[PDB]
Specification:
With about 210 residues, the protein is of the alpha/beta class. It folds into two domains: about 1-105, Response regulator (Rossmann fold, 3-Layer(aba) Sandwich); about 115-205, Winged helix-like DNA-binding domain superfamily/Winged helix DNA-binding domain (Arc Repressor Mutant, subunit A), CATH 1.10.10. It has seven helices and eleven strands. It has helices at about 15-20, 35-45, 60-70, 95-105, 140-150, 160-165, 175-190, and strands spanning about 1-5, 25-30, 50, 75-80, 85-90, 115-120, 120-125, 130, 135, 195-200, 205. A hairpin with a 2-residue loop joins strand 6 (about 115-120) and strand 7. It binds magnesium ion (MG). It comes from Streptomyces coelicolor (strain ATCC BAA-471 / A3(2) / M145). Pfam families: Response_reg (PF00072), Trans_reg_C (PF00486). GO terms for molecular function: metal ion binding; phosphorelay response regulator activity; transcription cis-regulatory region binding.
Amino acid sequence: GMRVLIVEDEPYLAEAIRDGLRLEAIAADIAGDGDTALELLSVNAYDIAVLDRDIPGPSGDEIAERIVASGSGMPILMLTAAGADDYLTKPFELQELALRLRALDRRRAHSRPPVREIAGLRLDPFRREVYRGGRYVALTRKQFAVLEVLVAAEGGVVSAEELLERAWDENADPFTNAVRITVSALRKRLGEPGIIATVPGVGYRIDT
Ligand SMILES: [Mg+2]
């Protein structure tokens, strides 16, 4: 079934909302503040984020911006007292929330969430961290952006030109030596065994 993240700070409310979804076959994790929300987003995968706007720590709008920047396409539903796919005013009927969640999910029912793990690597875009078999590998911003694209291709081949468009600038001056030296540095950082394969005329890919 569906897994959602509920971020709401009002006492008992986050737990009560998860409770109302339980028998709707919609499971949920909860958080009362933005720091906990980000920590959960670094570890678990969710189908939708339900975010109260005014919460302690990083606000609900700041969480929404970081989800949007992650490039996952995960739908976001904001809760308001009274960017984002939809907004819901508190208090709301539970059937109303379950309807919005299902509608948001089925719009993208056949799309796939990003590939963040392959061949031992785990990539977390929220903390911008890479783990190889559980071992932390520090990476520069450019190295991470290139690796993020290669991992998301799940062994598919990515040209040096696409890496330049996606990790430097969509209308960049097509010079690919910078991409080549960055991939080479990434290979040194990741270590043995070799995980980034070169396809001579086309580009690079994650091996196995
Ligand atoms: Mg609040």
